[PDB]
Amino acid sequence: SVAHGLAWSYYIGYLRLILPELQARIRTYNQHYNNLLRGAVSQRLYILLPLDCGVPDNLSMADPNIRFLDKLPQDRVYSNSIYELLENGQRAGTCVLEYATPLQTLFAMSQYSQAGFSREDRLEQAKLFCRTLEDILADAPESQNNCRLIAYQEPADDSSFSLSQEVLRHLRQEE
C-alpha cells in the first residue's frame, strides 16, 4: 500500500517540522501584522483531504466562499496561506488552510498507465492515507493539537456540497 509511505513521509518531511512552530507564527501574525478589519486567524493547520484526490491549483476556485487573505509569515521556508470563510455572504472564520499534497501523488499515479493504479485503487489508498496519518498524529500529541484533518467524500448532487461549509464544521467544533 503506497499510502503507508505517503503518510509517513508527509509527517516526517513536513508536518513534524512545520507544526511545532505554527502556534507561534499564527500568534505573531495576529499581534503584529496590522490591517484594520482583518479577523483573528484561528489556531491549527486545517488540511483538506478529498478522498477523490482532486486537488485544485486555486483553492478559491473550488469554492467562491473560500477567499485568499494572506501568506502566513515565517530553518527552512514553508508556504502556508490564510483564507477567510464566507457563509451567506458573511465572514464566518479565518484560518490556515491547504490540501494534503500527497493526494496529488495518488492522483498522478491513477493517471499514469504503467502504475497499474485504478480509481478504485486510488480511493482505497486515499482512505488508508487518512487512517495512517490520523494514527501517526494520535501518537504525536503536539502535532495532533496543531492540525485538523478534513476528510470528505463528495455527494453526487454537488449543489448539496460546500467546501467552505466543510471547513466551517470543523472550525466550529473547536469553539
Add this chain to the structure above:
Amino acid sequence: SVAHGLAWSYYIGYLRLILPELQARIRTYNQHYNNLLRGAVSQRLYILLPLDCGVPDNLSMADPNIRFLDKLPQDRVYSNSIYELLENGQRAGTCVLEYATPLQTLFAMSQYSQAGFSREDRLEQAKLFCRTLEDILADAPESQNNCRLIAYQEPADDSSFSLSQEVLRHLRQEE
C-alpha cells in the same frame, strides 16, 4: 510497508519532473565551461542509495575522492550538484550526483520511538525502496536512460570503503 509509497512519491514528485530537463542542463553546462573542462560532465543523474540510510550533510565528507565542483544551473527550482571523482590522484570522472532523499525518511523513522521501526526494519525497507524504484524506472525507459541507481552497503569486516569507486564502477559501464 513504507518503501513502495516512498519510491512512488520520489518518482512522481521529483524524478519524473527533473529528469526530462537534465540532459539539456548538463549539455548547456558543458558548452558554457568547455574551455575549462578537460572532460565533459557525464550525462545522467547518479543517485546514491546507501542501504544504511546514512545521508551525510554533504557528499564531500563521505570520500576525499569525491569533490564538489559546482551547482548545475537552472514553477519549481531544483538544486543539483556536479562532483569530480578522483582515482589514482587524478580526475577520473565528473557527474551530477546526489543521495536518494527518501532514505532520510527511513532513517528518521528508525530514530522515532513511536514508529516502532527497527534498524532491521529500516534495512529491509531500504532494499524494498531500491527494488521498487528500479522497477518503476524500467517501465519508464525514458527516465531509466536518464539516471542510475547506486545502491551499496559498507563492509562488515571494516575493510576500507571507497564511495568514489562505487560511482566510477557505474559511470564506466556507459563508456
